[PDB]
Structure formats: C-alpha cells, structure tokens
Design a protein around this ligand. Structure first.
Ligand SMILES: NCC(=O)Nc1ccc(OCc2ccccc2)cc1
Ligand SMILES: [Yb+3]
Ligand SMILES: [Zn+2]
Length: 610
C-alpha cells in the first residue's frame, strides 16, 4: 500500500529517508552560482541497501564523499522538467534503519529554475545585487541534490558565505554571523531549522536587507526604501498570528518574520517557515491586501505541519489554508465579510474552470501530475475548489464552530507528517462518526475526482456582495443614453474590497462597449488607483474592451512587477488585442532574459513564443 511520487526521480520514502541536511555554500554573484556541499543524513528503510537515487536539475557534481572517501555516482539522462536522476553507490550495504552521512559537492547553474539573480539595477537601492529562491513545487533539486518530494521531511542547518555588505536569510532561525576565514571580503551567516520540513520549504535570500520589529515575534525585512511602508502594511500580523494559534493550535516555529521581495517575486506569498516571503504588490498603503498574510500564516499549520504527500494532493495544503485564512478574516472583520470573500472565491473558481474548460484534467480537485510540469498545472483550482468542499462540509456538518473543531483535531493528528486525500477523508469520517449518514450524502467521486464546477454550490450570505452586483448590472445593461447617470457618488459606500468585486463581476461579462469603459474612467477615475488587485482588473477590463489608451498602462504593470497572477493575464490580454499584440510579444522578448525563470517560461507558452 505504498505511494509513489511521480514528480520525483529519487528513491522513495519506502527505500530511504533524508533526516537532515547540513548545507555549506557560497553565493557567487559574479558567476551566478551557488557552490558548496550538501551533507545529507540518510536512513535506510530497507535491508541490504547498496544504492540510492537523488533528484538534481542543472547541477554540476564535483564529488560524493562517504566515510571520508569518494564514492561512485552516475547522472542519468535529463527527463525534461524533472531534471536528471543521480544514482549513488554506497560503499557499505546498509541494514534497515541504519543512518549514514553523504556529502555531495555541487554547483548550481546560472539558469537554475529555483533562483532569480537580480542586477543592482533591478533592486531598490541600485548598488547591490540580489538573490532569492522559490523551491515549490519541485525546484529544490535545482539548488541541491535531494529527495525532492514532500513525502520526506528533514531538519537542516546551513552556513552561507556572501559578500560582507549583503545579508543572507533562510527559512530557519538565524544562528549568528562571522567573517569568512577563506575570503575576508565575505561573511558567513548560519541558520538552524529544528522542525522537520519538506524540502520545498527550504529558502534562501541574499541582498542589502534591513529589518524593523513589528511584533513580539515578527520582524519585517526588505531593502531600506520599503521598510517603513512594509512595517505599516503588515502591522496586523501579530493579531492574525494570535487568531491562527487559537484555531490551529500552538505556533511551533519560533519566529514569524516577513520578507518583502523585489517586484519580480512570482507569487503573492510563500510560506517559508520562520520567514514568509511576500510580493511588494501587497503594499497598497491601507492594509487592504492583508488576507495574503493571513494565508501564509495559516500555512504554519496546514501545509508546513500537515503536508501533502505528493503534489497530486496539493488541495490538502491549499483548501485548508484558504479555509483558515477566511476564518482569520472573519474574526477580524465579521462573518458577513468571511461570506463575501468565500463567494468571491467561488467566482475565481468559475473563472479558472472557464479558462481551462469544464472537462479539463486540472479542474479536478485531486489531480494526476504524471508527466505534467507542476508550474504549468498551477491554478486557483486547488485553492477554491478545495475551500468550496470544506465550506460545503461546514454547512452540512453543523456550522463553523463544529468544523473548526475538526480542523484543529486534524492538524493535531497529522502534525509533522505527509498525507493523502484518503488519509484526510478517513479522519473526517472518524471525527464525525456520529454524522456518517450526512457524510455519505456527499458525492465524493464528483467532488474529488471529476472536472468542472463542484456538484453543489454552498450557501453564501450576499449582504456585502449585493451592491457590487447591482452596480455591475447597471453598467452592463446601460445603453448610451444611460451613461450620463453614472457618477463618482456611485462608489461612496463601497470598500476597496467591494470596488474590486464590482470590477470582477464586470470583467466576467467583458468586453463592454468602449464608450462605457471611457465613461467609467471619466466618473470613477480608476486609472488613479494603485491597489494592485483593483488596477489589475481595471486594466484587464480596459484591454478586453479594446481601449488603446490602456495599452501602455497594461504593458507597464505587466513588466514593472512579476507576480504571475497579474503578469500572465495582462500579457495574454495584450496578446489577444490586435492593436497591442506585436508590442506585447516584443516586450516579452526584450524582458525575457531578466524575468524570473519560471515566469519567463510560462508567459512564453501563453504567448506561443519560442
Ligand atoms: N505560493 C507558491 C506556490 O504556491 N507555488 C507552487 C508552485 C507549483 C505548484 O503546483 C502544484 C500543483 C499541484 C496540483 C495541481 C496543480 C499544481 C504549487 C505551488
Ligand atoms: Yb434608453
Ligand atoms: Zn497557499
């Protein structure tokens, strides 16, 4: 009854398991390489184990040492996005449960899909270079040889040599700094991660970083020019951590720091333990995009403690995290607000299913990533279809207080483990044993394994959404002689969240007539809003409605930041608009080399370029 991770070429957990990584490396900005040694403490799960295989991707291996002597190893042929398997011949056959240390000397490639190297010009300060990693889902193998599967969890320690003027941070507790004895122009930063983690949660950033304390267990880190704005934007972090602890149980990770990255960071956030990474596009100036922080906080339980065993079961990570996320927002801002955000999430699920197609394999909750690059499959589906299932179960099983009881018991049960959907379902049934008749009424096969929208839509309070729908419908049904009736006062009683939902509702019916869009700018002045989510949707609405004036604005947003949620749809819209098509392609070509490697790959596919 053993499980296989079809995204990894390494030996499975049933054969051997990495227990610890000690990384010693040096960051060479001149060569854009990370060079050093990864010492893996590995425990045999088999009798008479004589070899094992590790994942690698575009790595250069110098040597492998065990027991102080070099051993034989072989790199297999590259298997596309999975990389190349590295088979290691053990000097002495191992008995079950025996542990040894394997020290591998390696160097990364400048084109490592895990890394983005930034020139000084690409940073805020314009004087120093900058490096950051992004290992999820399967890019850790592009930094170091490892069993690159979430089915294995390990602790780690690291020593990182960097230019003395720069700072290194990792997904771990800081353990001091000293000058580098082998090069006085450099400093060594040390780190300890004492809680076992999957290797996709290993993270490294190197740059001219400064910190400010914003809570009892939270520093914000960024380049100097962003520190003050970040400190204010994320000031509710400790209050959210407090609520999360109430819902999930104790926070076991020690510190909860935030790092605000350069604009090319590909996602809204990444839940790296001890150090959440976030996009600077959260800096709206009014804390309105703070749900992303609530999301990353929640991962400290769902995802980082209870982890998906393979990426086929990613919805376990994201569905429960979004569920907890929206409860944090519900406690902060009220239950009607939780329902508003939930209903918005259904709307995002609609968009994703319509984008992929209602029969597409990636619209299933549990997917099959055999021979599929995870970055290509990545979408809102596991997030929102996952949340929808949990929200549906909440309402079926007696309400939020009852289901939050399940959530906390679930985290407790599977803490420090990696699990499948069947593990989750088995415990759901165990926990709600007295309500199995209700559980047996859900169409499990449809919810878990069928494409398309779920077989049943949950009940949503409409209170906060109603004004958004009403105004969107006024615009959509408006004829030319109705345009005069619209006025800035229309927006008087709408929050930024409601303005965003108004645009989301309207974008779902785009295009609108060009004259309507021009009137919208005339009376609402949406061009003036810097809120990234609002501006994103407004610009999409403009381009899809064929307003040439918006072309430079859309091109600017698409390139001045690199969050894929924004950059990909903007480029795709610009490509589909005949007037901007050639310029969209030219702009991608010009920027490609300086984009994040994953983002460059996906925009290229989207644009059918190269
Ligand atoms: N916030 C970073 C992040 O979520 N990145 C990431 C990158 C790739 C991933 O793909 C996983 C996957 C798993 C199932 C279905 C589609 C895609 C999942 C997550
Ligand atoms: Yb009329
Ligand atoms: Zn997440």
């Amino acid at each position: 009854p053993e499980i296989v991770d079809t995204c990894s070429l390494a030996s499975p957990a049933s054969v051997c398991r990495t227990k610890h990584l000690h990384l010693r490396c040096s960051v060479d900005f001149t060569r854009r390489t990370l060079t050093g040694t990864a010492a893996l403490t590995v425990q045999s799960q088999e009798d008479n184990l004589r070899s094992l295989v590790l994942d690698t991707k575009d790595l250069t291996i110098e040597k492998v040492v065990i027991n102080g002597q070099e051993v034989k190893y072989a790199l297999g042929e590259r298997q596309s996005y999975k990389g190349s398997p590295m088979e290691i011949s053990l000097p002495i056959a191992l008995s079950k449960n025996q542990e040894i240390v394997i020290e591998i000397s390696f160097e990364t490639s400048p084109k490592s899909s895990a890394l983005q190297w930034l020139t000084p010009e690409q940073t805020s300060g314009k004087e120093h270079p900058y490096l950051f990693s992004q290992c999820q889902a399967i890019h850790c193998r592009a930094i170091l040889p490892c069993q690159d599967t979430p089915s294995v969890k390990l602790t780690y320690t690291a020593e990182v040599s960097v230019p003395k003027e720069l700072v290194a941070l990792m997904s771990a507790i800081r353990d001091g700094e000293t000058p580098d004895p082998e090069d006085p122009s450099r400093k060594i930063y040390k780190f300890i991660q004492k809680v076992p983690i999957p290797c996709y949660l290993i993270a490294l950033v190197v740059g001219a970083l400064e910190s400010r304390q914003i809570g009892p267990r939270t520093l914000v880190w960024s380049e100097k020019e962003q520190v003050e704005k970040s400190a204010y934007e994320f000031s509710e972090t400790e209050s959210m951590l407090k609520i999360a602890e109430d819902l999930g149980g104790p926070y076991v990770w020690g510190q909860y720091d935030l790092l605000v990255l350069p604009p090319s960071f590909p996602y809204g956030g990444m839940e790296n333990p001890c150090l959440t990474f976030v996009t600077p596009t959260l800096l709206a100036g009014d804390k309105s995009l703070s749900n992303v922080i609530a999301h990353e906080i929640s991962h400290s339980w769902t995802g980082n403690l209870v982890t998906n065993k393979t990426w086929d079961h990613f919805w376990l990570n994201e569905g429960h995290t979004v569920y907890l996320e929206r409860h944090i927002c519900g406690r902060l801002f009220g239950e009607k607000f939780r329902h508003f955000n939930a209903l918005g999430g259904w709307g995002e699920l609609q968009n994703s299913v319509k984008t992929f197609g209602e029969t597409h394999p990636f619209t299933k909750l549990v997917v099959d990533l055999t021979d599929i690059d995870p970055d290509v499959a990545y979408s809102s589906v596991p997030y929102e279809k996952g949340f929808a299932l949990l929200f549906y179960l909440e309402q079926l099983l007696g309400g939020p207080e009852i289901f939050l009881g399940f959530l906390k018991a679930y985290v407790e049960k599977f803490s420090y483990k990696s699990i499948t959907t069947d593990d989750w379902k088995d415990f759901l049934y165990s926990y709600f044993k007295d309500k199995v008749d209700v559980l047996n009424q859900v169409d499990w096969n449809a919810w878990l394994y069928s494409p398309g929208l779920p077989p049943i839509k949950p009940n949503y309070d409409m209170t906060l959404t109603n004004a958004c729908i009403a105004l969107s419908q006024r615009w959509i049904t408006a004829k030319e002689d109705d345009l005069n009736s619209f006025n800035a006062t229309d927006l008087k009683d709408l929050s930024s969240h409601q303005l965003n939902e108004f645009l989301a509702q309207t974008l779902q019916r785009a295009p609108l007539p060009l004259g309507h869009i021009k009137r919208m700018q005339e009376v609402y002045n949406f061009n003036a809003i810097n809120n990234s989510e609002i501006r994103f949707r407004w610009l999409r609405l403009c381009i899809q409605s064929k307003w040439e004036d918006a072309i430079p604005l859309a091109l600017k947003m698409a390139t001045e930041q690199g969050r894929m949620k924004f950059t990909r749809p903007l480029f795709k819209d610009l490509a589909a608009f005949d007037k901007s098509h050639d310029q969209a392609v030219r702009t991608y070509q010009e920027h490609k080399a300086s984009m994040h490697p994953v983002t460059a790959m996906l925009v290229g596919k989207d644009l059918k370029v190269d």
